[PDB]
């Protein structure tokens, strides 16, 4: 329903919405090739239908094809900064289609 | 310490990954085991 | 630096085999993924094969499997193809191919191409 | 596969931004797509590996980009010396498959 939403915010006004008592299939995510970039470091994407944690924020905004490039981890430039950051530290699957 | 007989880039040692789940003490281990760990397509160049 | 001597140019009758070298003249050998390509006059290039010289092991592509045999001459510093079985199509100029993968370090494709036969 | 590129030559006089895509029929990976550029009579020569990870080596004004079932390599600033032959190059599973070829003309 969030994915399939009409409009979605600009990317200086990032929607945060709150995920709580609900099945997450992140094994599907993960097995599901429509999501252009799954990128992970943190789980193992298999064990990850397994692994449940208790509170998960998630951020939803939409960007130009260089600037999702540009967004990437260990990366300087201009969008990836400047109006909205993501921290090095977070433990976080970033997905992008 | 191995800096006096090694380290000149010296790449010549190798450590074996995922392509064992687990494995049994005391054993030698050199199969090849080509593109295993999990996958849907397999036994190929795969990336 | 790096370079791959080219024969001198060779016509052969139809079933017979061809051996293709494949020089390596400084850097560090044996550690590069080295593979095998060709390109047909007036067609793209195609690959054919990828050998791993530390346990010298080869996959042969589907549309050649059965026909290439590729191996790699850790001795000499060199690598070899012999093809068999050959026919009147089977006619084209060949290359040889070399650049790193390596594990989890990702870069899989890369140049360090030759120039021909 | 096939990997459809925009076009199969363009005719373009030079300094255009030029976007060099490829479009792979299912989808290859969002780091796992390379272009390669051939010299007249010569053999390729390697200028964006893994679809977004910039190549060594290499400087700024080539870039790919892309994700997903279309993928794209962009050419920033058109210079007299990059017209030429590039090729794409699947770099996913299965074996290396090349595209039918762009040469890019004056």
């Known amino acids: 329903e969030v994915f399939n939403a009409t409009r979605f915010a600009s990317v200086y006004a990032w929607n945060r919405k709150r995920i709580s008592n609900c099945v997450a299939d992140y094994s599907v995510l993960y097995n599901s090739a429509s999501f252009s970039t799954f990128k992970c470091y943190g789980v193992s994407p298999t064990k990850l239908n397994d692994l449940c944690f208790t509170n998960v924020y998630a951020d939803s905004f939409v960007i130009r094809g260089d600037e999702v490039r540009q967004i990437a981890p260990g990366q300087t430039g201009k969008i990836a900064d400047y109006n909205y950051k993501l921290p090095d530290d977070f433990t976080g699957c970033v997905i992008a289609w | 310490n191995s800096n006096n007989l090694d380290s000149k880039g010296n790449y010549n040692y190798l450590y074996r990954l995922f392509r064992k789940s687990n494995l049994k003490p005391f054993e030698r281990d050199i199969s090849t085991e080509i593109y295993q760990a999990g996958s849907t397509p397999c036994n190929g160049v795969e990336g | 630096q790096v370079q791959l001597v080219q024969s001198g140019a060779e016509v052969k009758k139809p079933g017979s085999s061809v051996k293709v070298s494949c020089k390596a003249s400084?850097?560090?050998?044996?550690?590069?993924?080295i593979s095998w390509v060709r390109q047909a006059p007036g067609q793209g290039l195609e690959w054919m094969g990828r050998?791993?010289?530390?346990?010298?092991?080869?996959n042969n592509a589907q549309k050649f499997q059965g026909r290439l045999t590729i191996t790699a001459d850790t001795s000499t510093s060199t690598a070899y193809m012999e093809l068999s079985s050959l026919r009147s199509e089977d006619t084209a100029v060949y290359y040889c191919a070399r650049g790193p993968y390596y594990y989890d370090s990702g870069g899989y494709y890369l140049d360090y191409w030759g120039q021909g036969t | 596969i096939v990997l459809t590129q925009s076009p199969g030559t363009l005719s373009l006089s030079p300094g255009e931004r030029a976007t060099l895509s490829c479009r792979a029929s299912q989808s290859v990976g969002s780091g796992y797509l390379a272009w390669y550029q051939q010299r007249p009579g010569q053999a390729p020569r390697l200028l964006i590996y893994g679809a977004s990870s910039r190549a060594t080596g290499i400087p700024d004004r080539f870039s790919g980009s892309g994700s997903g079932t279309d993928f794209t390599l962009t050419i920033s600033r058109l210079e007299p010396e990059d017209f030429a032959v590039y090729y794409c190059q699947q770099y996913a599973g299965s074996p290396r498959t090349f595209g039918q070829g762009t040469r890019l003309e004056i």
């Open positions: 050998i791993i010289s530390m346990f010298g092991i080869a």
């Open positions: 400084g850097g560090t050998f044996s550690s590069y993924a």
